[PDB]
Amino acid sequence: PPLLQLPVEVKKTELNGFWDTGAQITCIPEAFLKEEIPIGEAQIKTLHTKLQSVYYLKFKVLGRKVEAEVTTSPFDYVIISPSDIPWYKPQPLELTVKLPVQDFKKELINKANINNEEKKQLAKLLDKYDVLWQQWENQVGHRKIPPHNIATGTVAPRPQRQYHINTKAKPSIQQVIDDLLKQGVLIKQTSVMNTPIYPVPKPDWRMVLDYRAVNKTVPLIGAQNQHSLGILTNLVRQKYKSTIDLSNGFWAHPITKDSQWITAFTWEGKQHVWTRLPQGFLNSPALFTADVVDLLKNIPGISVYVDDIYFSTETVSEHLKILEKVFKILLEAGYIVSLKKSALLRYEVTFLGFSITQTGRGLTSEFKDKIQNITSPRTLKELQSILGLFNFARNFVPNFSEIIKPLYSLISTAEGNNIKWTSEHTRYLEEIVSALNHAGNLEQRDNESPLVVKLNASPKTGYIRYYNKGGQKPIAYASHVFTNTELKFTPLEKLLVTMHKALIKAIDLALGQPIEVYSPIISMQKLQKTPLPERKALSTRWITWLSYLEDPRITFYYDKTLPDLKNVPETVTDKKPKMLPIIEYAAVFYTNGSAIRSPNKSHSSGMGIVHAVFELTIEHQWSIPLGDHTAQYAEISAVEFACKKANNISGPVLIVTNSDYVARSVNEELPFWRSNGFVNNKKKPLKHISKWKNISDSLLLKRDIIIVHEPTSIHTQGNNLADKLATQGSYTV
RNA sequence: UUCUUGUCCAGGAGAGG
DNA sequence: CCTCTCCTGGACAAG
């Protein structure tokens, strides 16, 4: 049914003709009828339908003489009406492997979310446009446009040598190469330029065209390319929605004969060039996208990314009429639709890697399933893949840059191909995964309301929120942690750094609407002449913010409702520090004490600490008197002594007492004691407060110190040793 | 980095306090 | 010992 392309010769020149069932009269390029007398003028139905001069011409079609009425055309190919050659019978195209298009049709009607009476109407619609759907693997369409001149550079790239590639990919690529040859997309032709080719393994391979040398010479097309975050916010969220997929839209757009030389590549000795734009060329995405947005530009409320088309309506009848209208445009143009990659009439549909629901835009269930079954990384490539996968939800949850900063910092400390992974990093990953599992759907931007941003900043991170004026649910989130440069900023300066990032994404989300900024800033006019001593940044950062005030469309306010995060300190950590194996600690400290009754005196106490590095080795040992002091005082001074010695050694260190009280109190209350001025439950000064202060500050200077006490074990041997030393100290008095 | 969108890395070259 | 600028060469995700 998708017919075939047949050759045609006009004025003793070979050309390519397409048998068009919809064309009433045949058309020929303009450069061929310039020296001929027109019969007259007739209305010709195009997509732009103004009359052109009609002619009468004779030419050879497949070696057969024909005579017919013709009109001018800007194309480089010939269009042939079926009426003019009634002798010709259409021959269906033959490729390598056929698609279960009938099965694709049934999958789309079954997973369609309508009543049975509406399914019958849509089923007849799908059967009617059977020519539109891709019925063969690697099938390509024929877009009715003037070919693209892509060799628009003023200099040529150097030919590139081609290396050998894997043998198993070679026959998998040969199946698609032959398919593109039989459709006329690839022709075996030599050229001055040649580009390398390498294969990427498919999950079942694939072919990539390294076009770096070519792209370094071709200028950017004037058509800008859409941003994924912008089209997802600016789309309409109706109940009945559908997404259509154009299969190989790149290979449906022809290119001019004078530009095909640049698309050459050597495969198995022979050299091939492209009749249509290839994937990997610089401007090929922009021309495809710009073309498809132009056809459905008249159709309202419809987003479109590369090879996917999305729209939505509230009436199922309205949705059915749009599909017919869209299918007509795609068939008249020359595109083909992949049914296995498209979804129609679904309350919930996955568009651009995200699920569009009634509730709002949301993550894919398959994406959430992929998150949970993620192992801990082992190499740099593994970690990079994990980070890139996780990034999809940066706009979905605030504090994303906060919670992911350590992993991004771990990639910088990583050398070679191995990254230093710890048991604290895996707990971070499970926390990341759980936070992503507890995600929430966002709202969609509307063109009527002016965009409003709400931003607030802690001394460590700035937080951004995107809403609509009077809206409840936010459109997106944004977070940015301050760098080492930005952390030394004044809090006023940190708020402006946060506003900077908010305004770039706001411009992408503005949609030609005024922007309102809610922030803890009290005024902006006074910020223009801020005195220099209050500035901790340089002139450059201050100039960009001053430049933002000159924009009248945006306006700023002071939202006192915002939480005060500028002066709040970090809360007490409740996570228990995981312990490394005893061979991984730089040194291990065992501390002990003693109390002995003494002759009008209470005690004769002593201290006992040992320096041990790991087998186990006694590096240093200490035994000293303390005099008239309680047993608990000797223990606290013992673990204090080890904290100072631990401060001297680099790397994680482990300290153990034989007193559960000191170890338990240190882990459970030393942070609270640090803040409340070292007072007890009765709001009274602790005993040994000066000793607690020294332990406190030694714990802050070296935060990888782990205090714990467990006391027959491995630590029992040295606990007994340190206990022996405490007695000897006590006696020397 | 085939290319698009997005988040990052490194190298080099310099200039400023 | 910082900070900022602009050029080049790269990494990952899924389209």
Residue type, A167: T
Measured CA to C1', what is the nucleotide nearest A230?
B5
Nearest to A175 by CA among A144, A147, A201, A137: A137
A26-29 and A64-73 as β-strands: parallel, antiparallel, unpaired?
Answer: parallel
For the CA of A283 and the C1' of B2, the distance in angstroms is 12
Nearest to A432 by CA among A482, A389, A463, A474: A389
Task: State the DSSP code for A553.
Answer: S
Residue length, chain A?
733
Paired with A147 in beta bridges are none
Paired with A254 in beta bridges are A276
- Cite the beta strand spans of A175-239 per DSSP E: 186-188, 197-200, 206-209
Give CA–CA dist A139/A1, Å, rounded: 13
Sheet holding A265-267, edge to edge: A186-188, A270-274, A265-267
Residue A218: Cβ-neighbour burial (10 angstroms; 0-12, 13-18, 19+)? buried
Query: Which residues make Cβ contacts (< 8 Å) with residue A371, sequence separation at least 6?
Result: A389, A390, A433, A436, A437
A240-245 and A343-346 as β-strands: parallel, antiparallel, unpaired?
Answer: antiparallel
Can you tell me which residue has its alpha carbon closest to the C1' of nucleotide B9?
Answer: A412
Give the residue carrying structure tokens 């009938």. Answer: A102
Sign (positive or negative) of CA dihedral A399, A401, A402, A404? positive
Does strand C come within 7 Å of the CB of A206? no
Sign (positive or negative) of CA dihedral A219, A222, A223, A228? positive
Question: What are the backbone angles phi and psi of residue A649, rounded to the nearest 5°?
Answer: -90, 135
Compute CA A723 distance to the chain's CA centroid, rounded to the nearest angstrom: 58
For the CA of A657 and the C1' of B8, the distance in angstroms is 45
Q: For strand C, which nucleotides have at least one atom less than 7 Å from a protein CB?
A: 2-5, 10-15
Helix (DSSP H) and strand (DSSP E) numbers for chain A = 19, 29
Helix A380-390, helix A400-413: angle, nearest 10? 160
Give CA–CA dist A580/A588, Å, rounded: 12
Tokens of A115: 């009543």
Distance (Å) of CA A447 to CA A359, A450, A469, A513, A724: 19, 8, 11, 8, 79
Q: Phi-psi region for residue A107, left (φ > 0), alpha (ψ -120 to 50) or beta? A: alpha
Give the residue carrying structure tokens 């059977």. Answer: A130
Does strand B come within 7 Å of the CB of A394? yes
A330 three-state secondary structure? helix
Does strand B come within 7 Å of the CB of A175? no
Compute CA A488 distance to the chain's CA centroid, rounded to the nearest angstrom: 30
For the CA of A492 and the C1' of B12, the distance in angstroms is 35
Residue A176: Cβ-neighbour burial (10 angstroms; 0-12, 13-18, 19+)? middle
The beta-carbon contacts of A458-463 under 8 Å, at least 24 apart in sequence, are A458/A565, A458/A566, A458/A568, A459/A487, A459/A491, A459/A494, A459/A565, A459/A566, A460/A402, A460/A487, A461/A399, A461/A401, A461/A402, A462/A494, A462/A495, A462/A497, A462/A498, A462/A501, A463/A398, A463/A399, A463/A498, A463/A565
Give CA–CA dist A107/A103, Å, rounded: 6
HEC sequence for A603-643: ECEEEEEEEEECCCEEEEEEEEEEECCCHHHHHHHHHHHHH
Give CA–CA dist A248/A261, Å, rounded: 21
Tell me if A281 sits within 8 A of A149, measured CB to CB: no
**Any alpha helices (H) in A311-399, and if so which ranges?**
316-333, 365-372, 380-390
Nearest to A589 by CA among A723, A722, A710: A722
Question: What are the backbone angles phi and psi of residue A295, rounded to the nearest 5°?
Answer: -70, -45
Tell me if A50 sits within 8 A of A106, measured CB to CB: no
Q: Phi-psi region for residue A11, left (φ > 0), alpha (ψ -120 to 50) or beta? A: left
Tell me if A540 sits within 8 A of A584, measured CB to CB: no
Measured CA to C1', what is the nucleotide nearest A307?
C15
Give CA–CA dist A73/A249, Å, rounded: 23
Give CA–CA dist A186/A374, Å, rounded: 41
For the CA of A495 and the C1' of B15, the distance in angstroms is 28
Tell me if A654 sits within 8 A of A586, measured CB to CB: no
The method of structure determination was X-ray
Tokens of A677: 């001025």
Where b means 16+ CB within 10 Å and e means fewer, A603-625 reads bbbbbbbbbbbeeeeeeebbbbb
Give CA–CA dist A555/A360, Å, rounded: 28
Give CA–CA dist A33/A218, Å, rounded: 33
Nearest to A46 by CA among A76, A21, A79, A23: A23
Largest CA distance in chain A: 135
Tell me if A99 sits within 8 A of A137, measured CB to CB: yes
Query: Which residues make Cβ contacts (< 8 Å) with residue A301, sequence separation at least 6?
Result: A236, A311, A312
Tell me if A93 sits within 8 A of A136, measured CB to CB: yes
Residue type, A572: V
**Any alpha helices (H) in A511-603, and if so which ranges?**
525-528, 539-549
Task: State the DSSP code for A257.
Answer: G
Compute CA A242 distance to the chain's CA centroid, rounded to the nearest angstrom: 23
Tokens of A617: 């080795």
Question: Catalytic positions of A, please?
Answer: 20
Nearest to A473 by CA among A436, A517, A440, A511: A440
Helix H or strand E segment including A573: none
Give the residue carrying structure tokens 């003037």. Answer: A146
User: Which residues in 159-178 of chain A line strand C, with CB less than 7 A from it?
Assistant: none
Give CA–CA dist A342/A228, Å, rounded: 19
| Three-point CA angle A300, A303, A307, nearest 5° | 130
The beta-carbon contacts of A408-411 under 8 Å, at least 24 apart in sequence, are A410/A383, A411/A380, A411/A383, A411/A384, A411/A387
Does strand B come within 7 Å of the CB of A205? no
| Three-point CA angle A179, A183, A188, nearest 5° | 80
Residue type, A497: V
**DSSP labels, A69-94:** EEEEESSSSEEE-GGG-TT-------
Query: Which residues make Cβ contacts (< 8 Å) with residue A508, sequence separation at least 6?
Result: A227, A229, A230
Does strand C come within 7 Å of the CB of A353? yes
Tell me if A705 sits within 8 A of A655, measured CB to CB: yes
User: Which residues in 39-68 of chain A line strand B, with CB less than 7 A from it?
Assistant: none
Give CA–CA dist A668/A572, Å, rounded: 10
A206-209 and A52-61 as β-strands: parallel, antiparallel, unpaired?
Answer: unpaired
Task: State the DSSP code for A255.
Answer: B
Tokens of A89: 């019978």
Does strand B come within 7 Å of the CB of A617? no
Tell me if A136 sits within 8 A of A99, measured CB to CB: yes
Nearest to A453 by CA among A416, A494, A506: A506
Give CA–CA dist A126/A323, Å, rounded: 10
For the CA of A485 and the C1' of B13, the distance in angstroms is 22
Give CA–CA dist A310/A548, Å, rounded: 35
A653-656 and A302-305 as β-strands: parallel, antiparallel, unpaired?
Answer: unpaired
Give CA–CA dist A470/A443, Å, rounded: 13
Q: For strand B, which nucleotides have at least one atom less than 7 Å from a protein CB?
A: 1-10
Give CA–CA dist A576/A528, Å, rounded: 47
Measured CA to C1', what is the nucleotide nearest A195?
B2
A265-267 and A40-42 as β-strands: parallel, antiparallel, unpaired?
Answer: unpaired
Tell me if A312 sits within 8 A of A241, measured CB to CB: yes
Paired with A178 in beta bridges are none
Residue A122: Cβ-neighbour burial (10 angstroms; 0-12, 13-18, 19+)? buried
Query: Which residues make Cβ contacts (< 8 Å) with residue A264, sequence separation at least 6?
Result: A189, A190, A191, A192, A193, A194, A195, A271, A272, A273
Does strand B come within 7 Å of the CB of A395? no
Tell me if A638 sits within 8 A of A666, measured CB to CB: no
For the CA of A211 and the C1' of C7, the distance in angstroms is 21
Task: State the DSSP code for A339.
Answer: G
Does strand C come within 7 Å of the CB of A475? no
Give CA–CA dist A423/A449, Å, rounded: 48
**DSSP labels, A122-139:** HHHHHHHTTTTB--BTT-
For the CA of A128 and the C1' of B8, the distance in angstroms is 49
Other beta carbons within 10 angstroms of residue A720's beta carbon come to: 14
Give CA–CA dist A604/A634, Å, rounded: 10
Half-sphere exposure for A211 (CA within 13 Å, toward CB): 20
Tell me if A624 sits within 8 A of A722, measured CB to CB: no
